[PDB]
Structure formats: structure tokens, C-alpha cells
Design a protein around this ligand. Structure first.
Ligand SMILES: *[C@@H]1O[C@H](CO)[C@@H](O[C@@H]2O[C@H](CO)[C@@H](O[C@@H]3O[C@H](CO[C@H]4O[C@H](CO)[C@@H](O)[C@H](O)[C@@H]4O)[C@@H](O)[C@H](O[C@H]4O[C@H](CO)[C@@H](O)[C@H](O)[C@@H]4O[C@H]4O[C@H](CO)[C@@H](O)[C@H](O)[C@@H]4O)[C@@H]3O)[C@H](O)[C@H]2NC(C)=O)[C@H](O)[C@H]1NC(C)=O
Ligand SMILES: *[C@@H]1O[C@H](CO)[C@@H](O)[C@H](O)[C@H]1NC(C)=O
Ligand SMILES: *[C@@H]1O[C@H](CO)[C@@H](O)[C@H](O)[C@H]1NC(C)=O
Ligand SMILES: *[C@@H]1O[C@H](CO)[C@@H](O)[C@H](O)[C@H]1NC(C)=O
Ligand SMILES: *[C@@H]1O[C@H](CO)[C@@H](O)[C@H](O)[C@H]1NC(C)=O
Ligand SMILES: *[C@@H]1O[C@H](CO)[C@@H](O)[C@H](O)[C@H]1NC(C)=O
Ligand SMILES: *[C@@H]1O[C@H](CO)[C@@H](O)[C@H](O)[C@H]1NC(C)=O
Ligand SMILES: *[C@@H]1O[C@H](CO)[C@@H](O)[C@H](O)[C@H]1NC(C)=O
Lengths: 130, 111, 85, 48, 48
């Protein structure tokens, strides 16, 4: 199977950009799976940030559209998230996970419905403070 | 957004007793007959681990005591029997409409 | 839709239950107007739908009225071969 | 109604076979339009 | 007159916007009655 390991700053000064890189080990990011970011924080259940397909197309959570960008590095086999203007409200544990797809048809025409995040990493705890 | 109401916030049973945890979506998550309701076990200190996919299908490697059910917006997930290793916060997730949303989380504890 | 009753309820003959007096709204020369028509139909021509009845043929086809000026009396027909036969 | 998922109707033409087919067409077109030229295939123009 | 809605608003495929679920008051065998019919039409067949 494939394991996911995250790394990045666990402490970010308010209003700067957090950058998290998730390494994919044992699998291949350039495959028929979607990669995504999820966060958890006391008082808040899991909240989805966004997801990427190795073609570069990506979907984002409507409330974060102005602040979160994600990308895929095919040569490094890495999935990155850049979140700008971080606030105290953004303190959370950030997980990288693989979203399994039904692909009931020709992927060129869409025909994929997301079906379960089956592989999760361990989570990077990020506190916003200075 | 599709809002997921999860109930109870906390449920506890003694060992050997079956437990049911409910998830009520604000809207329908069934797309052309497939119920896109997912169910995860998040042990304290651990990431969530997918247990049930497409509402009732058990994920490979997950003990047979787990199963699901439901249609439209009303889903019921269950553990039969609950074992000592099942103490965890359990969440429901929808993939019917972006953004993806998660439930509040129900804490299953021994009693 | 027809609204039918038994034409005569007092019959002791084999016609009891046959021949119904059916009221219906039939069209007329102008599209805007309708006329109320009372007519007698044989039971075999009217089937209960749920009293409300329809013609037996509404289930399968349109009905063409025979021209009243054209007789149904059989006439002799001779068949004649073409030359060479 | 439709049972199951809704999927787009489509046609599938093999790339290798079609590419060979066009190669044959380009040489035969060149026999009438001249050699040392460029033959372009493009999608149809608008209309019904 | 047809009253149409998108058959499935949850599609993310190339088929989104195709296959409208149209309702109409259709005639029946008897001239005095009407029936409500729901049917699917392709987008190309129905004009607003
Ligand atoms: C024209 O050209 C295109 C371009 O390739 C080609 O596209 C492909 O179309 C097929 C359908 O026609 C798509 O099929 C689906 O593919 C997924 C993914 O397959 C991989 O993963 C599965 C397991 O996860 C492996 O078995 C497989 O080898 C691959 O590694 C499958 O998961 C889908 O499987 C379901 O449908 C099959 C169809 O019978 C079933 O046999 C299978 O058991 C699965 O059943 C599920 O769906 C059924 C209905 O769909 C349902 O009844 C079951 O209960 C169950 O839910 C499926 O094979 C394929 O992904 C497309 N490829 C691309 C581009 O992604 C077209 O097929 C081609 N068409 C013509 C005209 O020739
Ligand atoms: C007509 O007579 C038949 C005889 O069987 C009876 O069943 C039916 O109820 C009668 N209808 C009316 C309207 O009186
Ligand atoms: C004819 O139409 C009127 C309304 O114009 C209706 O009340 C009446 O019942 C109809 N007659 C029959 C026999 O159905
Ligand atoms: C109407 O037609 C069907 C076949 O299309 C037949 O089975 C049925 O008996 C018919 N109705 C009556 C009243 O005979
Ligand atoms: C069309 O919409 C109506 C709305 O009530 C629904 O009942 C019906 O099932 C829809 N048709 C199809 C074919 O899905
Ligand atoms: C079309 O389907 C037939 C089924 O036997 C298969 O042999 C053939 O290779 C297919 N052709 C293409 C171009 O997909
Ligand atoms: C159906 O989808 C099309 C796609 O462009 C959209 O414009 C339209 O508003 C949709 N209709 C409804 C009733 O949501
Ligand atoms: C059918 O006719 C009724 C008459 O009241 C009308 O309200 C309704 O909108 C019509 N249905 C359609 C689909 O046009």
C-alpha cells in the first residue's frame, strides 16, 4: 500500500502563508486517484480544504477559494498546499489523504464521483501564533 | 453546502452490545441510485480511517462487525458487537456535492 | 366518457341488461360549442370504466362511420382471367 | 427513466489505425495538390 | 407547453445540462380526459 507523510512549519506568524508538502511513498501521485487536504480542530469537525487530480485541475471549498492553492509535483511525487493570510481561527491538524474514485465511464467526460478517502497520513499540527 | 447532522454526540454501551449512530444529511446524497455516504473511525490521536464506503459497503481489512445502511438523507451506521478496540470518535462524510462535508463526530466509549 | 343507464329496467325478456341509454358531450360544427347527446348503444359496444362507460373500441383504434348511403347487400362478383390465361 | 449512472454516448476510433489512414490520405492528396506542401485536417465549420 | 427541470443536478460529467425531466398534460384515449406525463428529453429537442 501507499503511505503519506507531511512536513512543514508547525508554527506560523499571523497573516503569512503556510506551506505543507505531503510525500507519497509506495504509490504514485500520477494515478487514477484524487489527492486532498482535510483539517481538524477543537470545536470544529473535519473540514475539507481542496482536492487535486494529477492533470492539474482542482476543486476547492467555497469559503477558502480566495486563500488556498494546491499543486502536484510529478517529479517529486509530492502534493502541496499553500494557505495565505492565516489567522488564529486556522489552528488545526492538517491531513493529506487519497480519495478513491468510482470512474464509471470515460474519465475524459468527467464520469468520476468521489468515493471514500481510504489512505490518510498522520497529520501536521499547526498553531498560528507570534 | 450539504450539512450533515450527526446524533448522538456521545453514545456508550457495555462490551458485547450493538450500537447504532445516526447521520442526517440536509439534502439527498444519492446520485443515480448510489448512496454517497462514507463512515470513518478516528481513534484519539490518530487520523480517521475509512470503514464504510457508498453507505453500506465494508472496506477491505475492516472487521466484519462493521456495516452501514440508509438512503436519500437518512443513514444509520452500526457496530455489532462493539469491542474494546472500538472506542473512537466516528464521523459521516458526503461526496454528493462539493464542498465535501463531515459530520460533528460521535464519541463511542465503553460502559 | 359516456354516462349510461339501462334503457328499460322493467324488462323480463332476454333484452334485460342490454341496450343502454348513454348521455355524452359530443362536438358540433363550431369548435367553441358542445352538444349534449342522448343515444342508445348495445351493451356489447359500451364497456364500464369506473355509470361511466366508453366505447369498446377506444382501447384499440379510431372508429370510422360507414356511409349510410352505401348498401351492405352482397352483389355477385365474377372473376375473369387476363389474356393468355 | 434511466437505471444507474448517466453516461455520455461516444465513439471510439483507434489512434494507430486512424493515423495510418490519414497518412494514406495525405499522400494521395499530395498527388493532386503537389509535393513539399502542408496538408492540414481541422474540425468542420459551423452550420446545422 | 412543457415544464422542464434538469434530470440530475448533481452530475459533474459532460452530460450535465442534457436529459431534461419535462412534465406535460398529455391527451388520453378518451377525448374528455387528460393525463400528467413525465418524460426525459435531450436538450437538443427542447427549446425555451
Ligand atoms: C471507449 O473508449 C473509452 C476510453 O478508454 C473506454 O473507457 C472506459 O469505459 C469503461 C466502461 O465502458 C469504464 O469502466 C469502468 O472502469 C472502472 C475502473 O476500472 C479500473 O478499476 C476496476 C476496479 O476498480 C478494474 O476492474 C479495472 O480493470 C480497472 O483497473 C471500473 O471500476 C468499472 O467497473 C464497473 O463496471 C464494469 C462494467 O461492467 C463492471 O464489470 C465492474 O464489475 C464494475 O461494476 C460496477 O459498475 C456496474 C455498472 O457500471 C454496476 O452494475 C456494478 O454493481 C458496480 O457498481 C468500469 O469497468 C472505464 O473506466 C473507462 N476508461 C477510462 C477512460 O477511465 C470505453 O469503454 C470505450 N467504449 C467502447 C464503445 O468500447
Ligand atoms: C342494468 O341491468 C343489469 C342486469 O344485470 C344490472 O346488473 C345493472 O345494475 C343495471 N343497471 C342499471 C343502471 O340499472
Ligand atoms: C358535459 O360537460 C359538462 C360541463 O360543460 C359536465 O358537467 C357534464 O357532466 C358533461 N356530461 C357528461 C355526460 O359527461
Ligand atoms: C383492452 O385491450 C387489451 C389489450 O391491449 C385487452 O387485454 C383488454 O381486455 C382490453 N379491454 C377490454 C375491456 O376488453
Ligand atoms: C421528474 O420530476 C418529478 C418531480 O416530482 C419526479 O417525480 C420524477 O421522478 C422525475 N422523473 C424522472 C424520470 O426522474
Ligand atoms: C470493438 O469491439 C470488438 C468486440 O469484439 C473488439 O474486438 C474490437 O477491438 C473493438 N474495436 C475498437 C476500435 O475498440
Ligand atoms: C441545468 O443546467 C444548465 C447548465 O448550463 C444550467 O444553465 C441550468 O440553469 C440548469 N437548470 C436548472 C433548472 O437548474
Ligand atoms: C395541467 O393543467 C392544469 C390545470 O389546472 C395546470 O394547472 C397545470 O399546470 C398543467 N400542467 C402542465 C404540466 O402544464
Amino acid at each position: 500500500q501507499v503511505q503519506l507523510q507531511e512536513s512543514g512549519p508547525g508554527l506560523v506568524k499571523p497573516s503569512e502563508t503556510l506551506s505543507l508538502t505531503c510525500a507519497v511513498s509506495g504509490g504514485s501521485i500520477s494515478s487514477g486517484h484524487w489527492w486532498s487536504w482535510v483539517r481538524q480542530s477543537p470545536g470544529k469537525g473535519l473540514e475539507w480544504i481542496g482536492t487535486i487530480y494529477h492533470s492539474g485541475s482542482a476543486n476547492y471549498n467555497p469559503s477558502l477559494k480566495s486563500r488556498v492553492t494546491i499543486s502536484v509535483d510529478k517529479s517529486k511525487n509530492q502534493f502541496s498546499l499553500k494557505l495565505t493570510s492565516v489567522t488564529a481561527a486556522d489552528t488545526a491538524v492538517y491531513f493529506c489523504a487519497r480519495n478513491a474514485i468510482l470512474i464509471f465511464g470515460v474519465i475524459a467526460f468527467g464520469e468520476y464521483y468521489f468515493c471514500g478517502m481510504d489512505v490518510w497520513g498522520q497529520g501536521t499540527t499547526v498553531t498560528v501564533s507570534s | 453546502d450539504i450539512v450533515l447532522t450527526q446524533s448522538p454526540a456521545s453514545l456508550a454501551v457495555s462490551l458485547g452490545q450493538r450500537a447504532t449512530i445516526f447521520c442526517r444529511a440536509s439534502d439527498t446524497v444519492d446520485i443515480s441510485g448510489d448512496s454517497f455516504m462514507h463512515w470513518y473511525q478516528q481513534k484519539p490521536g490518530q487520523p480517521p480511517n475509512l470503514l464504510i464506503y457508498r453507505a453500506s459497503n465494508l472496506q477491505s481489512g475492516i472487521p466484519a462487525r462493521f456495516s452501514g445502511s440508509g438512503s436519500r438523507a437518512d443513514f444509520t451506521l452500526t457496530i455489532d458487537p462493539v469491542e474494546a478496540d472500538d472506542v473512537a470518535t466516528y464521523y459521516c462524510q458526503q461526496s454528493s456535492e462539493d464542498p465535501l462535508t463531515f459530520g460533528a463526530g460521535t464519541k463511542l466509549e465503553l460502559k | 366518457t359516456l354516462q349510461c343507464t339501462n334503457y328499460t329496467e322493467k324488462l323480463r325478456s332476454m333484452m334485460k341488461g342490454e341496450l343502454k341509454n348513454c348521455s355524452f358531450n359530443m362536438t358540433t360544427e363550431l369548435r367553441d360549442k358542445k352538444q349534449k347527446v342522448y343515444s342508445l348503444f348495445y351493451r356489447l359496444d359500451v364497456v364500464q370504466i369506473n355509470k361511466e362507460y366508453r366505447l369498446i373500441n377506444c382501447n384499440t383504434s379510431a372508429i370510422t362511420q360507414a356511409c349510410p348511403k352505401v348498401s351492405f347487400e352482397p352483389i355477385p362478383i365474377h372473376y375473369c382471367a387476363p389474356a393468355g390465361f | 427513466d434511466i437505471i444507474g449512472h448517466i453516461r455520455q454516448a461516444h465513439c471510439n476510433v483507434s489512434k494507430a489505425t486512424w493515423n495510418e489512414t490519414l497518412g494514406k490520405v495525405v499522400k494521395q492528396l499530395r498527388k493532386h495538390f503537389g509535393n513539399n506542401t502542408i496538408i492540414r485536417f481541422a474540425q468542420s465549420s459551423g452550420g446545422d
